[PDB]
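By convention, the token line describes the chain's fold. To illustrate:
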Amino acid sequence: STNPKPQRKTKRNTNRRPQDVKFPGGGQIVGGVYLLPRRGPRLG
């Protein structure tokens, strides 16, 4: 048997896309997903 709690463990990451929207390497990841909607809130 094996029921820890999380469903990920073997496969784990594999493709990019998430490793960018988290503003990785200089980006708490909680602000670039926020830099998506108000991308340039000052245009005039």
In short: The chain has no helices and no strands. The radius of gyration is 16 Å. The CA atoms of residues 6 and 44 lie 48 Å apart.
